[PDB]
C-alpha cells in the first residue's frame, strides 16, 4: 500500500507516511497574482541549456522523467532569486484526465492542463541526494501547459511514450534539447516550498513562469495513454498525477515583473 494518486493512496493520505505533508513550506500553492509583490531586487532568470545532455526517459509509475547527464557543469539555472548555480538533473510533467485540470500550481485558482517541472540541484552540495537535505538544495522551474497549437519541441517526447507505457519501463533518449519547451518570456513568480510528491522534502526554491506553453490536444492525449500500473497488471491510466494547492502559511510569493 505505497503512495500514489487514487482514492486510496492519494494526496489526502500522504501525511500518514510523510508528516511534513502538513509542514510550513509545502508545494504547490495558488499564486494570487494581485498579492504577489513585484520585487525589483530579483534578477532575470539565467537558463543555460546549450550543453544539456539527455540520456534516458523513464516511466516511474507516477510520471515519466527525462533524465540528464549531470556529471559535468553544463545545463545550469542561475540568477532569478537564486544564489549560486543549480544543475539540471531531470524534467517531468503533471497532467489531468481533462484539459480543465492537471497543473499543480494554480494562478488565481486557474488550473492549467499540465505543468512541466525542470529540476536542478545546488552544486554547493555536490550531488542531488545531499542537496535535497538542504532548504536551498533544489530549484524547480515550473512551466504551465495549455491546450492549443502543438509544441514542436515536445513531439520527440510524445513519440517515445509508446515505448515506456508501463511502470518501470525506460528508453534511451539522447540529444533532447529542453530549450524547445520554454516559452517566450522568462517572467516568473518565486517562493520557498517543497517537493510535490513524497518524500515532500522542504528543499525547493520554486520559480514558476507566468507564460504558459501551448501543446496540442493530440500531444496531451498521448500523455494520458501512459499507465501507472506495470506490464501485465490491470490498466490504470496515468492521469491526474497532480497534488492540489497547499496552505501558503507564512510565505510571500514574489514577482519578477511589473
Ligand atoms: C519526489 C520529487 C522528486 C523530484 C526530483 C522532483 C519533484 S517535484 N514534483 O517537486 O518537481 C518531486
Ligand atoms: Zn513535479
Curated annotation (Swiss-Prot):
The record marks 5, 60, 65 as: Fine-tunes the proton-transfer properties of H-64. Its cofactor is Zn(2+); Co(2+). Changing residue 16 to E: In Jogjakarta. Changing residue 63 to F: Reduced activity. Changing residue 60 to T: Reduced activity. Changing residue 65 to L: Reduced activity. Changing residue 104 to D: Normal CO(2) hydrase activity. Residues 1-257 form the Alpha-carbonic anhydrase domain. The keyword Magnesium does not apply. InterPro entries: CA_dom, CA_dom_sf, Carbonic_anhydrase_a-class, Carbonic_anhydrase_a-class_CS. Changing residue 197 to H: Higher affinity for bicarbonate. Enhanced proton transfer capacity. Changing residue 140 to H: Impaired activity. It is an enzyme of class 4 (lyase). Changing residue 195 to E/H/R: Strongly reduced CO(2) hydrase activity. Zn(2+) binds at residues 92, 94, 117. Its main location: cytoplasm. The keyword Lyase applies. Pfam families: Carb_anhydrase. Activated by X-ray, histamine, L-adrenaline, L- and D-phenylalanine, L- and D-histidine, L-His-OMe and beta-Ala-His (carnosine). Changing residue 60 to V: Reduced activity. Its EC number is 4.2.1.1, 4.2.1.69. Target of drugs used in treatments against glaucoma disorder and breast cancer. Belongs to the alpha-carbonic anhydrase family. Catalyzes the reversible hydration of carbon dioxide. Can also hydrate cyanamide to urea. Stimulates the chloride-bicarbonate exchange activity of SLC26A6. Essential for bone resorption and osteoclast differentiation. Involved in the regulation of fluid secretion into the anterior chamber of the eye. Contributes to intracellular pH regulation in the duodenal upper villous epithelium during proton-coupled peptide absorption. This is Carbonic anhydrase 2. It comes from Homo sapiens (Human). The lineage of its organism: Eukaryota, Metazoa, Chordata, Craniata, Vertebrata. The gene is CA2.
Amino acid at each position: 500500500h505505497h503512495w500514489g494518486y487514487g482514492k486510496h493512496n492519494g494526496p489526502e493520505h500522504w501525511h500518514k507516511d510523510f508528516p511534513i505533508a502538513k509542514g510550513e513550506r509545502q508545494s504547490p500553492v495558488d499564486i494570487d497574482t494581485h498579492t504577489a509583490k513585484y520585487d525589483p531586487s530579483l534578477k532575470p532568470l539565467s537558463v543555460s541549456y546549450d550543453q544539456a545532455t539527455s540520456l534516458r526517459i523513464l516511466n516511474n509509475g507516477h510520471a515519466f522523467n527525462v533524465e540528464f547527464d549531470d556529471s559535468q557543469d553544463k545545463a545550469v539555472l542561475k540568477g532569478g532569486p537564486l544564489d549560486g548555480t543549480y544543475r539540471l538533473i531531470q524534467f517531468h510533467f503533471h497532467w489531468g484526465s481533462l484539459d480543465g485540470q492537471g497543473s499543480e500550481h494554480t494562478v488565481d485558482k486557474k488550473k492549467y492542463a499540465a505543468e512541466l517541472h525542470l529540476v536542478h540541484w545546488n552544486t554547493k552540495y555536490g550531488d542531488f541526494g545531499k542537496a535535497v537535505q538542504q532548504p536551498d538544495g533544489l530549484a524547480v522551474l515550473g512551466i504551465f501547459l495549455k491546450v492549443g497549437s502543438a509544441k514542436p519541441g515536445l513531439q520527440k517526447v510524445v513519440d517515445v511514450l509508446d515505448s515506456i507505457k508501463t511502470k518501470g519501463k525506460s528508453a534511451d533518449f539522447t540529444n533532447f534539447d529542453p530549450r524547445g519547451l520554454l516559452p517566450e518570456s522568462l517572467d516568473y513568480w518565486t517562493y520557498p516550498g517543497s517537493l510535490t510528491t513524497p518524500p515532500l522534502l522542504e528543499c525547493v526554491t520554486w520559480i514558476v513562469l507566468k507564460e504558459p506553453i501551448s501543446v496540442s490536444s493530440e500531444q496531451v492525449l498521448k500523455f494520458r495513454k501512459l499507465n501507472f500500473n506495470g506490464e501485465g497488471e490491470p490498466e490504470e491510466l496515468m492521469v491526474d498525477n497532480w497534488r492540489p494547492a497547499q496552505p501558503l502559511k507564512n510565505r510571500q510569493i514574489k514577482a519578477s515583473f511589473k
